[PDB]
Amino acid sequence: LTEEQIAEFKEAFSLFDKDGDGTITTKELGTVMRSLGQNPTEAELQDMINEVDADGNGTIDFPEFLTMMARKSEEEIREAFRVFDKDGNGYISAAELRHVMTNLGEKLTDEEVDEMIREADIDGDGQVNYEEFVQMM
Amino acid sequence: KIYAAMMIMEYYRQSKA
Ligand SMILES: [Ca+2]
Ligand SMILES: [Ca+2]
Ligand SMILES: [Ca+2]
Ligand SMILES: [Ca+2]
Numbered sequence: 077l078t079e080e081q082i083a084e085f086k087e088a089f090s091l092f093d094k095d096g097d098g099t100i101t102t103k104e105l106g107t108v109m110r111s112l113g114q115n116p117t118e119a120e121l122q123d124m125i126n127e128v129d130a131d132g133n134g135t136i137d138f139p140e141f142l143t144m145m146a147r148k149s150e151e152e153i154r155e156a157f158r159v160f161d162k163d164g165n166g167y168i169s170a171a172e173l174r175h176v177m178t179n180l181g182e183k184l185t186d187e188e189v190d191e192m193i194r195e196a197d198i199d200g201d202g203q204v205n206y207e208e209f210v211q212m213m
Numbered sequence: 214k215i216y217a218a219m220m221i222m223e224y225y226r227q228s229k230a
Contacts, residue, residue: 084223084226084227085223087226088219088222088223088226091222091225091226092222105215105218108218108222109218112218112221123214124214124215125215127214127215128215144215144216144219145219148216152214152216152217152220153217153220155214155217156217156218156220156221159217159221177225180225182229192228212224213220213224
């Protein structure tokens with residue numbers, strides 16, 4: 077575990093911790109899951125927090141986030157792939173990638189989107205398959 | 214489950230900067 081990795085996870089933790097108070101509530105986990113096209117129930121959101129929770133106090137703080145991010149898998153990558161692959165055809169098109177990305181809080185122009193695809197696209201078909209997705213994650 | 218969101222977000226941060 078390197079100072080550089082610790083730093084990245086910290087910057088990652090921030091994006092979940094909206095109010096910047098230093099805790100992830102189910103309220104903020106719910107904001108994240110929803111902009112990823114999911115609709116978890118308040119008890120599903122509570123189940124996900126117990127997965128990280130060490131105290132039993134209902135919130136994730138940074139040391140608990142780090143424990144988890146560090147402890148860690150094929151199941152979770154496929155699960156992430158599915159968030160992007162909305163029509164379930166096994167390829168992430170530029171429309172689908174743009175769609176997910178704006179929901180998270182960007183507006184990319186078509187050239188920004190195509191740049192990102194070009195970066196991921198090994199076989200040059202202009203869409204991201206699963207092999208290529210592991211590579212970018 | 215929760216880790217998938219974690220890596221989508223890591224990718225997302227990695228992409229904003
Ligand atoms: Ca918070
Ligand atoms: Ca806690
Ligand atoms: Ca697709
Ligand atoms: Ca491709």
